Design a protein around this motif. Structure first.
Motif, PDB file in Angstrom:
ATOM      1  N   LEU A  45      -9.398  45.299 -15.794  1.00 25.89           N
ATOM      2  CA  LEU A  45      -9.166  45.161 -17.226  1.00 25.89           C
ATOM      3  C   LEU A  45      -9.893  46.265 -17.895  1.00 25.89           C
ATOM      4  O   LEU A  45     -11.102  46.372 -17.694  1.00 25.89           O
ATOM      5  CB  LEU A  45      -9.751  43.836 -17.716  1.00 25.89           C
ATOM      6  CG  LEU A  45      -8.834  42.673 -17.924  1.00 25.89           C
ATOM      7  CD1 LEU A  45      -9.653  41.418 -18.140  1.00 25.89           C
ATOM      8  CD2 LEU A  45      -7.908  42.915 -19.091  1.00 25.89           C
ATOM      9  N   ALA A  46      -9.207  47.110 -18.663  1.00 28.06           N
ATOM     10  CA  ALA A  46      -9.895  48.214 -19.338  1.00 28.06           C
ATOM     11  C   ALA A  46     -10.885  47.668 -20.381  1.00 28.06           C
ATOM     12  O   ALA A  46     -10.545  46.730 -21.112  1.00 28.06           O
ATOM     13  CB  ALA A  46      -8.889  49.147 -20.012  1.00 28.06           C
ATOM     14  N   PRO A  47     -12.133  48.192 -20.429  1.00 28.51           N
ATOM     15  CA  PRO A  47     -13.085  47.717 -21.454  1.00 28.51           C
ATOM     16  C   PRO A  47     -12.491  47.888 -22.861  1.00 28.51           C
ATOM     17  O   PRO A  47     -11.877  48.919 -23.141  1.00 28.51           O
ATOM     18  CB  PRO A  47     -14.315  48.611 -21.230  1.00 28.51           C
ATOM     19  CG  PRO A  47     -14.206  49.055 -19.782  1.00 28.51           C
ATOM     20  CD  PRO A  47     -12.729  49.263 -19.597  1.00 28.51           C
ATOM     21  N   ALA A  69      -6.304  49.359 -32.632  1.00 24.00           N
ATOM     22  CA  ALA A  69      -5.128  48.652 -32.103  1.00 24.00           C
ATOM     23  C   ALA A  69      -5.342  48.344 -30.615  1.00 24.00           C
ATOM     24  O   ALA A  69      -5.805  49.221 -29.877  1.00 24.00           O
ATOM     25  CB  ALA A  69      -3.872  49.501 -32.305  1.00 24.00           C
ATOM     26  N   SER A  70      -5.055  47.096 -30.187  1.00 27.12           N
ATOM     27  CA  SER A  70      -5.286  46.619 -28.814  1.00 27.12           C
ATOM     28  C   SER A  70      -4.415  47.318 -27.716  1.00 27.12           C
ATOM     29  O   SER A  70      -3.410  47.977 -28.007  1.00 27.12           O
ATOM     30  CB  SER A  70      -5.064  45.112 -28.743  1.00 27.12           C
ATOM     31  OG  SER A  70      -3.752  44.773 -29.157  1.00 27.12           O
ATOM     32  N   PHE A  71      -4.833  47.178 -26.446  1.00 22.73           N
ATOM     33  CA  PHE A  71      -4.045  47.708 -25.328  1.00 22.73           C
ATOM     34  C   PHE A  71      -2.959  46.690 -25.036  1.00 22.73           C
ATOM     35  O   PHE A  71      -1.798  47.054 -24.854  1.00 22.73           O
ATOM     36  CB  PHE A  71      -4.908  48.006 -24.076  1.00 22.73           C
ATOM     37  CG  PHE A  71      -5.993  49.050 -24.239  1.00 22.73           C
ATOM     38  CD1 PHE A  71      -5.708  50.298 -24.794  1.00 22.73           C
ATOM     39  CD2 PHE A  71      -7.293  48.800 -23.802  1.00 22.73           C
ATOM     40  CE1 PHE A  71      -6.708  51.269 -24.930  1.00 22.73           C
ATOM     41  CE2 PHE A  71      -8.297  49.755 -23.965  1.00 22.73           C
ATOM     42  CZ  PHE A  71      -7.992  50.991 -24.510  1.00 22.73           C
ATOM     43  N   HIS A  72      -3.327  45.398 -25.096  1.00 21.94           N
ATOM     44  CA  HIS A  72      -2.386  44.311 -24.864  1.00 21.94           C
ATOM     45  C   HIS A  72      -1.363  44.245 -26.003  1.00 21.94           C
ATOM     46  O   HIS A  72      -1.701  44.453 -27.171  1.00 21.94           O
ATOM     47  CB  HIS A  72      -3.100  42.962 -24.637  1.00 21.94           C
ATOM     48  CG  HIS A  72      -3.678  42.315 -25.862  1.00 21.94           C
ATOM     49  ND1 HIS A  72      -5.049  42.298 -26.092  1.00 21.94           N
ATOM     50  CD2 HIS A  72      -3.065  41.597 -26.839  1.00 21.94           C
ATOM     51  CE1 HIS A  72      -5.216  41.600 -27.210  1.00 21.94           C
ATOM     52  NE2 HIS A  72      -4.050  41.176 -27.704  1.00 21.94           N
ATOM     53  N   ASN A  73      -0.103  44.011 -25.640  1.00 23.00           N
ATOM     54  CA  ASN A  73       1.015  43.927 -26.577  1.00 23.00           C
ATOM     55  C   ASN A  73       2.154  43.169 -25.921  1.00 23.00           C
ATOM     56  O   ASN A  73       2.142  42.981 -24.702  1.00 23.00           O
ATOM     57  CB  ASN A  73       1.453  45.342 -27.032  1.00 23.00           C
ATOM     58  CG  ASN A  73       1.979  46.227 -25.924  1.00 23.00           C
ATOM     59  OD1 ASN A  73       3.177  46.239 -25.615  1.00 23.00           O
ATOM     60  ND2 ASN A  73       1.102  46.999 -25.315  1.00 23.00           N
ATOM     61  N   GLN A  74       3.115  42.702 -26.728  1.00 28.00           N
ATOM     62  CA  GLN A  74       4.282  41.949 -26.265  1.00 28.00           C
ATOM     63  C   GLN A  74       5.550  42.820 -26.293  1.00 28.00           C
ATOM     64  O   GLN A  74       6.662  42.286 -26.385  1.00 28.00           O
ATOM     65  CB  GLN A  74       4.471  40.669 -27.120  1.00 28.00           C
ATOM     66  CG  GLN A  74       3.539  39.511 -26.737  1.00 28.00           C
ATOM     67  CD  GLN A  74       3.447  39.299 -25.239  1.00 28.00           C
ATOM     68  OE1 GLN A  74       2.376  39.448 -24.632  1.00 28.00           O
ATOM     69  NE2 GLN A  74       4.573  38.961 -24.606  1.00 28.00           N
ATOM     70  N   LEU A  75       5.386  44.150 -26.171  1.00 27.05           N
ATOM     71  CA  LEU A  75       6.498  45.093 -26.240  1.00 27.05           C
ATOM     72  C   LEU A  75       6.665  45.955 -24.984  1.00 27.05           C
ATOM     73  O   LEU A  75       7.501  46.864 -24.983  1.00 27.05           O
ATOM     74  CB  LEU A  75       6.285  46.010 -27.456  1.00 27.05           C
ATOM     75  CG  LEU A  75       6.450  45.351 -28.825  1.00 27.05           C
ATOM     76  CD1 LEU A  75       5.519  45.982 -29.838  1.00 27.05           C
ATOM     77  CD2 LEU A  75       7.898  45.404 -29.293  1.00 27.05           C
ATOM     78  N   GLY A  76       5.876  45.690 -23.944  1.00 26.08           N
ATOM     79  CA  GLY A  76       5.929  46.462 -22.709  1.00 26.08           C
ATOM     80  C   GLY A  76       5.422  47.887 -22.845  1.00 26.08           C
ATOM     81  O   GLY A  76       5.621  48.702 -21.939  1.00 26.08           O
ATOM     82  N   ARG A  77       4.745  48.192 -23.967  1.00 24.78           N
ATOM     83  CA  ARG A  77       4.189  49.513 -24.261  1.00 24.78           C
ATOM     84  C   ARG A  77       2.926  49.788 -23.416  1.00 24.78           C
ATOM     85  O   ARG A  77       2.045  48.925 -23.281  1.00 24.78           O
ATOM     86  CB  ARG A  77       3.870  49.634 -25.767  1.00 24.78           C
ATOM     87  CG  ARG A  77       3.604  51.065 -26.248  1.00 24.78           C
ATOM     88  CD  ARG A  77       2.833  51.108 -27.556  1.00 24.78           C
ATOM     89  NE  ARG A  77       1.432  50.713 -27.373  1.00 24.78           N
ATOM     90  CZ  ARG A  77       0.905  49.577 -27.825  1.00 24.78           C
ATOM     91  NH1 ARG A  77       1.648  48.720 -28.517  1.00 24.78           N
ATOM     92  NH2 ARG A  77      -0.371  49.294 -27.596  1.00 24.78           N
ATOM     93  N   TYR A  78       2.855  50.993 -22.842  1.00 20.22           N
ATOM     94  CA  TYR A  78       1.708  51.442 -22.059  1.00 20.22           C
ATOM     95  C   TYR A  78       0.805  52.300 -22.949  1.00 20.22           C
ATOM     96  O   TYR A  78       1.255  52.782 -23.988  1.00 20.22           O
ATOM     97  CB  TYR A  78       2.153  52.223 -20.795  1.00 20.22           C
ATOM     98  CG  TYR A  78       2.701  51.382 -19.655  1.00 20.22           C
ATOM     99  CD1 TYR A  78       3.041  50.040 -19.843  1.00 20.22           C
ATOM    100  CD2 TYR A  78       2.899  51.930 -18.395  1.00 20.22           C
ATOM    101  CE1 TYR A  78       3.571  49.274 -18.803  1.00 20.22           C
ATOM    102  CE2 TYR A  78       3.454  51.182 -17.356  1.00 20.22           C
ATOM    103  CZ  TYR A  78       3.786  49.854 -17.562  1.00 20.22           C
ATOM    104  OH  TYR A  78       4.309  49.116 -16.525  1.00 20.22           O
ATOM    105  N   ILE A  90      -3.023  52.480 -19.010  1.00 18.61           N
ATOM    106  CA  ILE A  90      -3.218  51.054 -19.205  1.00 18.61           C
ATOM    107  C   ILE A  90      -1.868  50.404 -19.539  1.00 18.61           C
ATOM    108  O   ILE A  90      -1.174  50.867 -20.451  1.00 18.61           O
ATOM    109  CB  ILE A  90      -4.298  50.828 -20.326  1.00 18.61           C
ATOM    110  CG1 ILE A  90      -5.637  51.587 -19.989  1.00 18.61           C
ATOM    111  CG2 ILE A  90      -4.530  49.343 -20.570  1.00 18.61           C
ATOM    112  CD1 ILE A  90      -6.676  51.741 -21.165  1.00 18.61           C
ATOM    113  N   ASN A  91      -1.523  49.290 -18.834  1.00 20.00           N
ATOM    114  CA  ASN A  91      -0.255  48.595 -19.068  1.00 20.00           C
ATOM    115  C   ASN A  91      -0.371  47.662 -20.300  1.00 20.00           C
ATOM    116  O   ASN A  91      -1.416  47.638 -20.940  1.00 20.00           O
ATOM    117  CB  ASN A  91       0.232  47.851 -17.801  1.00 20.00           C
ATOM    118  CG  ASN A  91      -0.546  46.616 -17.375  1.00 20.00           C
ATOM    119  OD1 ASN A  91      -1.439  46.115 -18.061  1.00 20.00           O
ATOM    120  ND2 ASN A  91      -0.223  46.108 -16.213  1.00 20.00           N
ATOM    121  N   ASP A  92       0.709  46.930 -20.640  1.00 21.83           N
ATOM    122  CA  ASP A  92       0.803  46.051 -21.816  1.00 21.83           C
ATOM    123  C   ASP A  92      -0.109  44.801 -21.712  1.00 21.83           C
ATOM    124  O   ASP A  92      -0.231  44.050 -22.674  1.00 21.83           O
ATOM    125  CB  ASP A  92       2.271  45.610 -22.027  1.00 21.83           C
ATOM    126  CG  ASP A  92       2.901  44.841 -20.866  1.00 21.83           C
ATOM    127  OD1 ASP A  92       2.379  44.937 -19.725  1.00 21.83           O
ATOM    128  OD2 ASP A  92       3.984  44.268 -21.062  1.00 21.83           O
TER     129      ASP A  92
END
Ligand SMILES: [Cl-]
Length: 136
Positions: free
Chosen positions: A11-13, A19-28, A114-116
């Motif tokens: 998990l990236a620190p 704006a977060s790394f996690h998203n519900q759009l499949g964006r890297y 970093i993935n979504d």
């Protein structure tokens, strides 16, 4: 199952200062660390930012963080290098920042794909490998 760290599969620190790394759009996210005082990191930054411009905002976001202490050095450099200002960020504390220690930047300037889900899937990616990864 997951652990926070800088290795692929970790998990990236989180970056607080954003704006977060996690998203519900499949964006890297391409997280890149550089500084004007490190010639090599500066040249990789230009090459990576221009590679990201080949893709849409929906596929990949670039997050380039300068570790130069002076804001004027960051501003002048990003202007000279003609980089997309929306992808260039500045950590004013530099070496003294929690970020620098969290990403083990004493071992050198690095980048992370970093993935979504906020998981590092690749480290020190080249423009060429970034494109091969984003197209598969
Ligand atoms: Cl984050």
């Amino acid at each position: 199952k997951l652990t926070e760290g800088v290795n692929p599969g970790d998990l990236a620190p989180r970056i607080e200062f954003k704006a977060s790394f996690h998203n519900q759009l499949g964006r890297y996210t391409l997280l890149n660390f550089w500084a004007a005082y490190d010639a090599e990191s500066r040249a990789r930054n230009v090459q990576l930012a221009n590679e990201v411009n080949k893709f849409g905002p929906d596929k990949i976001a670039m997050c380039s963080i300068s570790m130069d202490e002076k804001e004027s050095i960051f501003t002048e450099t990003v202007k000279i290098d003609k980089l997309d200002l929306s992808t260039q960020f500045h950590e004013g504390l530099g070496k003294e920042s929690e970020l620098y220690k969290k990403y083990d930047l004493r071992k050198g300037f690095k980048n992370f794909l970093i993935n979504d889900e906020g998981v590092i899937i690749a480290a020190n990616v080249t423009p060429e490998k970034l494109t091969e990864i984003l197209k598969a």
